[PDB]
């Protein structure tokens with residue numbers, strides 16, 4: 001009777017339910033940022049969510065800012081992802097890759113040749129960044145040249161090609177939470193005088209150039225995009241956030257994308273924040289006519305209410321899905337939720353990753369069986 005559990009038709013993709021695994025960085029890639037059988041098991045365990053969106057995945061080394069996140073820019077990486085999509089699909093799930101570029105939210109120690117992180121403008125974000133050699137203050141980024149934007153758009157296009165080869169059903173453009181594309185959108189961080197700056201249509205230009213490039217690889221109905229309309233995360237700030245996103249979302253709605261994915265302002269990246277705001281999903285439902293995913297702070301009842309009042313079509317759960325790989329079944333059965341342990345969110349191994357229990361141990365068996373079948377299929381002989 002919960003609409004959270006109703007099957008849903010995402011333009012030909014037959015999702016088992018209306019719940020989404022939110023994208024979640026977990027910093028557990030193998031060498032050279034290559035996914036492992038362990039990551040395949042983690043996603044296979046979570047195959048019962050109607051749609052999985054992967055952890056952010058950098059389209060280049062230039063686009064990384066955190067240790068051991070997976071990439072999608074080499075064939076070695078694609079081959080590792082193949083285990084992930086194989087295992088998920090053998091469990092009859094559906095999975096999109098989230099394409100990432102951290103922009104200024106990085107450190108030269110992550111960058112090729114010790115180069116500075118790149119960004120629209122040379123403003124450092126207030127805060128500290130973890131590096132291979134300890135915590136360090138943020139560097140002033142290098143502002144990108146006009147000629148280098150098309151280069152990064154092309155990195156997205158190649159990443160989409162690689163995602164398709166790795167067997168992903170679709171891709172999600174990360175345009176939220178203070179990374180490169182969000183930095184271009186906002187005028188606390190955009191400070192360009194060329195066509196990628198100033199105008200609200202100039203500050204969104206890169207986002208629509210990325211969409212153009214990846215929609216030459218995937219049909220637009222298999223390309224999603226994620227936005228954080230009102231967050232202070234990673235020193236973000238805009239002069240007229242209501243104006244900025246009204247246009248973007250309205251411009252997005254005519255692009256015939258797979259979906260629009262909105263983060264609630266009550267989330268500040270990866271933690272909850274007490275924040276009153278008008279730019280939540282109720283505000284954007286009218287301004288976007290396609291499939292709308294709402295994310296951030298939901299429980300069973302609040303997520304259910306968004307769907308009943310038709311304020312969104314799909315609800316994404318992050319931290320609860322870390323801890324409850326069978327979250328849909330727990331909701332259907334009215335079962336307790338495993339508590340999430342934040343100390344094992346980032347980095348490490350199976351602990352706090354694949355060792356959260358299931359209601360039905362056969363679910364856990366089947367995920368393991370497909371992870372190991374997947375490795376045998378795609379092993380690097």
Ligand SMILES: Cc1cc2nc3c(=O)[nH]c(=O)nc-3n(C[C@H](O)[C@H](O)[C@H](O)COP(=O)(O)O)c2cc1C
Pocket residue numbers: 022023024025026054055056098174176177226263267269270271295296297298316317318319320345346
């Ligand atoms: C550990 C962790 C990792 C995350 N990684 C990503 C990410 O890679 N990309 C992204 O868009 N959001 C990421 N998020 C934000 C989540 O997708 C989600 O919006 C957030 O957890 C709030 O949703 P929730 O209340 O259901 O947990 C992450 C959040 C957490 C807690």
